[PDB]
């Protein structure tokens, strides 16, 4: 589904942007926090049959 992927792209992007060669520990940390926030958001919206 698109809506799930959209939420994931947006949330994980914000986590990268606000996270501040590249530093992979920081990237993995940011993406991991993104997955946690994204998963809870999706599951939450699903429960309210919004998504």
């Amino acid at each position: 589904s698109a809506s799930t992927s959209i939420i994931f792209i947006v949330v994980n992007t914000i986590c990268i942007i606000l996270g501040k060669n590249i530093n992979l520990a920081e990237l993995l940390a940011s993406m991991s926090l993104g997955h946690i926030i994204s998963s809870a958001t999706v599951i939450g919206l699903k429960s309210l049959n919004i998504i």
């Binding site: 530093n23 520990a25 920081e26 940390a29 991991s32 999706v42 599951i43 699903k46 429960s47």
Partner: protein, 739 residues
């Protein structure tokens, strides 16, 4: 970083024939029998052997592997006795009408009488450890699986014993390795607890769920597929839980509601087994696994991300508390005693939480209506908790004597606590007197009023009422929570709070526990006994280093008998002596807790139901009117319930009759040590030594009376053993007869 020194300690038996090699004081050898006792007392006091924190840490790490080996041997033994010497399979087939047994005695001097008639054609000792219920929940259906687990246990034991040897003698970590507390926490949270819980979820979903669902539907154990069949043939699973048809796609796409058939939030109990729903237990462990794996990413290790424990601690300071948590990080990374104190306090407290939670939310099938197991598990775990809490006091005091320094603790929380120790102890003293009078005093009032023929003047449900209204209100909240403040839960966490009477066979598993005056009174007894135990232990810790009486107490050490008869007399001022006294109060406290449990359950919970629905409790509701006087406890509890143990001779319960008397003996023998002193005994020994010298048979290792401290240690150890084993025998004989 991994930091290690290699080939540190040679492996030979040279030092095994050199007793007390580990200590400068003991290595010279005995002149006196005192040396023999000192050898044992000092064997594991590693920081008294050396000043090196690295050396101490290495011994500890290795000793821990030794403990794990011992635990694996014990665990292996339990499984092996299950496989070889038990009626497990027979019980599996008919769990309502067979008593579990996994110990069988040899026929010598008539002891085969102890092989009781437990059913399933079997004769043996009835066990109360709850192993059978554990194994049923794990999905074990045959003796082969128990045998293989037993063998795996012996393999693990040998592996722990190797690791212990290896990490002491061959590859001992450096101190810097042990002080990696951030890394240790990350691994113990995410790795040990997190992956442990995830792994167990895996077992639950793939093995326990299907097998137990088939057992509960009424399929004969031998006709149930073996665990691997459910893994290889998914259709077997999908028959029982249809969501398995959808596979793992719901997981990765976050359609987790698809799995709501095997991951539930039911609450209450399985009506067939009287245990928690395994689908709830599966979901519990999955949720716990996720939280723990996240928790274990908190602390900074080898990358930029994470918290410094030191930085967190150092930030938490306010206007009432000086430098706050400054200096605690240094304490807790340089003192093993400080770590032990915290960890014993929490492990003990946890054991006590387990006791309460397991009786009220019985997690295993056929646990609740196995009254002997319910009583045994609650009692066992309460005792373990008590002993650990007293240990926390011991190690807190040892820290204060040996590891505390003023320079590390300038105006931090630790310093500020000891600077108002008189305010703390005086107030705790007062609250103990208040609680004592307004709890125990109410029983004495009641005894007096009832003896005088004035029942209307008593504190009771039918006279002057003391209703526990707050507890009653909480019970009500919990009973109405499902579909309200817990909208997606179907039933109460526990039927103890209110709701239905759950029964298995015709036995009551669990039902609401009413709280009245008798419950109010005994709760304030518990408050009292716990506050006094705290008083004694806290006082030991805060006055370990000094007092107005003894300004230089720390120089005398943790464990010393006194500082002489001057200053009025100074017996039992040491930190160790506070642990000694604290043990008696812990014993007193926990004895009343387990007595409360035993009587309340028999009076108001356990029993039979008719088809009509008429509950018949084991002691017929006598608690409300009998448990409000000391005479009621003496008569309706001790005298009445001792009938089983005291009439056990000539039956399979005769062992309990013997243990009951034997335990009374050991208890009374303790008093010889507690009430006397070594001056008397050393003089007596002088006359006896005279007779040996006369007959040229006096030993070169000169006989001495026990040290003052050893006299106390021997006394309290026999007091506890005798006291606790008496209750053990009392409880088991009773509950095995009527339950």
């Amino acid at each position: 970083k991994v930091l290690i020194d290699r080939n540190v300690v040679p492996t030979n038996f040279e030092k095994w024939s050199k007793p007390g090699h580990f200590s400068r004081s003991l290595a010279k050898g005995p002149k006196t029998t005192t040396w023999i006792w000192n050898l044992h007392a000092d064997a594991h006091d590693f920081d008294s052997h050396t000043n090196s924190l690295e050396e101490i840490s290495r011994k500890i790490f290795s000793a821990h592997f030794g403990q794990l080996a011992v635990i694996f041997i014990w665990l292996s033994g339990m499984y092996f006795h299950g496989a070889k010497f038990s009626n497990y399979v027979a019980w599996l087939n008919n769990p309502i009408n067979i008593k579990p047994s996994a110990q069988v005695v040899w026929p010598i001097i008539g002891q085969e009488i102890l092989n009781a008639d437990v059913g399933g054609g079997f004769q043996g000792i009835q066990i109360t450890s709850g192993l059978f219920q554990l194994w049923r929940a794990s999905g074990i259906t045959n003796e082969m699986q128990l045998y293989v687990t037993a063998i795996g246990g012996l393999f693990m034991a040998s592996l722990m014993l190797f690791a212990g040897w290896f990490h002491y003698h061959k590859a001992a970590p450096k101190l810097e390795w042990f002080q990696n507390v951030e890394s240790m926490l990350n691994h113990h949270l995410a790795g040990l607890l997190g992956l442990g819980s995830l792994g167990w979820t895996g077992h639950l979903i793939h093995v326990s769920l299907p097998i137990n669902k088939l057992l509960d539907s009424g399929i004969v154990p031998a006709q149930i597929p073996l665990p691997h069949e459910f893994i290889l043939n998914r259709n077997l699973m999908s028959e029982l839980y249809p969501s398995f048809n959808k596979g793992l796609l719901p997981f990765f796409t976050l359609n987790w509601n698809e799995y709501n058939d095997f991951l539930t939030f039911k609450g209450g109990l399985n009506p067939v087994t009287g245990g928690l729903w395994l689908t709830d237990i599966a979901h519990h462990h999955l949720a716990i696994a996720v939280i723990f794996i996240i928790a274990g990413h908190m602390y900074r290790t080898n990358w930029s991300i994470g918290h410094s424990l030191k930085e967190i601690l150092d930030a938490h300071k306010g206007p009432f508390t000086g430098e706050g948590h400054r200096g605690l990080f240094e304490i807790l990374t340089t003192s093993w005693h400080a770590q032990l104190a915290i960890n014993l306090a929490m492990l003990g407290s946890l054991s006590i939480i387990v006791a309460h939670h397991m009786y009220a939310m019985p997690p295993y099938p056929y646990l609740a209506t196995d009254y002997p197991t319910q009583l045994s598990l609650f009692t066992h775990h309460m005792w373990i908790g008590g002993f650990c809490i007293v240990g926390a006091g011991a190690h807190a005091a040892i820290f204060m004597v040996r590891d505390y320094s003023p320079a590390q603790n300038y105006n931090n929380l630790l310093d500020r606590v000891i600077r108002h120790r008189d305010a703390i102890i005086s107030h705790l003293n007062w609250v103990c007197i208040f609680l004592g009078f307004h709890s125990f005093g109410l029983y004495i009032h009641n005894d007096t009023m009832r003896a005088l023929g004035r029942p209307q003047d008593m504190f009771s449900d039918v006279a002057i009422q003391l209703q526990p209204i707050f507890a009653q209100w909480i019970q009500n909240c919990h009973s109405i929570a499902p579909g309200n403040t817990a909208p997606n839960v179907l039933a109460t966490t526990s039927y103890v709070f209110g709701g239905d009477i759950i029964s298995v066979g015709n036995k009551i598993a669990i039902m609401p526990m009413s709280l009245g005056t008798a419950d109010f009174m005994v709760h304030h007894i518990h408050a009292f006994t716990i506050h006094v135990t705290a008083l004694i232990l806290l006082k030991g810790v805060l006055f370990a280093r000094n007092s107005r009486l003894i300004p230089d107490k720390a120089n005398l050490g943790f464990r010393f008998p006194c500082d002489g008869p001057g200053r009025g007399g100074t017996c039992q001022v040491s930190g160790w002596d506070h642990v000694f006294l604290g043990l008696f109060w812990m014993y007193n406290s926990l004895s009343i807790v387990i007595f409360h449990f035993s009587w309340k359950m028999q009076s108001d919970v356990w029993g039979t139901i008719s088809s009509s629905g008429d509950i018949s409790h084991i002691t017929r509701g006598n608690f409300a009117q009998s448990a409000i006087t000391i005479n009621g406890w003496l008569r309706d509890f001790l005298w009445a319930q001792a009938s089983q143990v005291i009439q056990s001779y000539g039956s399979s319960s005769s062992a309990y009759g013997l243990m009951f008397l034997g335990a009374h003996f050991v208890w009374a023998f303790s008093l010889m040590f507690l009430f006397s002193g070594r001056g008397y005994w050393q003089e007596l020994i002088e006359s006896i030594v005279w007779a040996h010298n006369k007959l040229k048979v006096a030993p070169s290792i000169q006989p001495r009376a026990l040290s003052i401290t050893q006299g106390r240690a021997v006394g309290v150890a026999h007091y506890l053993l005798g006291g606790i084993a008496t209750t053990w025998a009392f409880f088991l004989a009773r509950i095995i007869a009527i339950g």
